[PDB]
Design a binder for this molecule. Sequence first.
Ligand SMILES: *P(=O)(O)OC[C@H]1O[C@@H](n2cnc3c(N)ncnc32)[C@H](O)[C@@H]1OP(=O)(O)OC[C@H]1O[C@@H](n2cnc3c(N)ncnc32)[C@H](O)[C@@H]1O
Ligand SMILES: *P(=O)(O)OC[C@H]1O[C@@H](n2cnc3c(N)ncnc32)[C@H](O)[C@@H]1OP(=O)(O)OC[C@H]1O[C@@H](n2cnc3c(N)ncnc32)[C@H](O)[C@@H]1O
Lengths: 143, 147
Amino acid sequence: IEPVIIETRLELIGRYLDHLKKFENISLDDYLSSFEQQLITERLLQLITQAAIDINDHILSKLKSKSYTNFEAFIELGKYQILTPELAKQIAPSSGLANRLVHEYDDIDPNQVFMAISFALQQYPLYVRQINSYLITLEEEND
Amino acid sequence: NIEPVIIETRLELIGRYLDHLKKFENISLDDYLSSFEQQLITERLLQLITQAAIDINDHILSKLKSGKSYTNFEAFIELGKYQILTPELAKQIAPSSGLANRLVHEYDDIDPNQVFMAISFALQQYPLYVRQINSYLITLEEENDLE
Ligand SMILES: *P(=O)(O)OC[C@H]1O[C@@H](n2cnc3c(N)ncnc32)[C@H](O)[C@@H]1OP(=O)(O)OC[C@H]1O[C@@H](n2cnc3c(N)ncnc32)[C@H](O)[C@@H]1O
Ligand SMILES: *P(=O)(O)OC[C@H]1O[C@@H](n2cnc3c(N)ncnc32)[C@H](O)[C@@H]1OP(=O)(O)OC[C@H]1O[C@@H](n2cnc3c(N)ncnc32)[C@H](O)[C@@H]1O
């Protein structure tokens, strides 16, 4: 496992969350009225989830050199206790959110993106902390 | 016929996205590079415009190409060969398929300097795309009515 590959993406997730947090108090009616605010939060959520999918793929490629869907990849990290199983279960559906936001499914419901903001702001800081704690362990073993 | 309705809805969306993108036509590079939020808005607008056009092109060519395959870049060039787009526009606008692939993260990392230039390219080219597809839409409706 290459720490800098993982840490670069974790830092990006943290940056994107920092920007997404600027939206955490916007009312739904103002959100639905502002296409540009929908665009910003949709792209932030896409970038966050795609960075996580990339992190998970890198980690699993070094451990289980088996193939997982993006949803299962979160679950598998839970089995390795790299994520907690509870976080892995909660956050795995953000893989479907990523697909939704690149138009792999049908239209985007802004009401559901609005609610997803608060769950991303809860779950992904924990994802970052858990992956960071794993990376730090690997680094402190090398030392 | 379902193809005209499909094209017309997507053209209406492209027109709306272009209206929002036009707000950024006069932004300076330094202003753009210093505002992550303006980068996000323009990146997603470009993603939505190009994806809608890719959808249109797929529906146009499925009627004309009897199962023959094509990439999203190639679809734009095929429209030029069919004189649905002018060849000049077709070759100018085909690389927007590569922009779209980068914006949905098929590969690579996003260079904001390239996205900055794509704002101008899209504001020049996609209004012409809309006009020319709209002219084809009329021909299609006439052909369906004539058959
Ligand atoms: P894709 O087909 O990957 O996602 C669709 C749906 O299936 C869920 N899923 C994928 N793979 C699995 C496995 N292996 N097990 C169980 N479930 C799986 C995936 O999590 C996704 O779930 P959804 O709850 O439909 O969506 C995830 C997430 O997206 C937001 N959401 C939902 N519907 C939306 C609309 N219409 N607009 C905008 N956002 C939407 C919610 O945040 C939801 O939790
Ligand atoms: P992807 O693999 O989709 O595209 C790669 C590259 O190849 C071009 N291409 C695809 N198919 C063909 C055919 N049949 N013939 C000739 N060329 C083809 C495709 O247009 C793309 O060109 P690029 O110049 O790499 O990119 C197109 C477009 O994207 C923006 N761009 C470029 N680099 C970017 C970064 N780093 N970030 C964000 N956007 C970027 C530019 O607007 C460029 O014009």
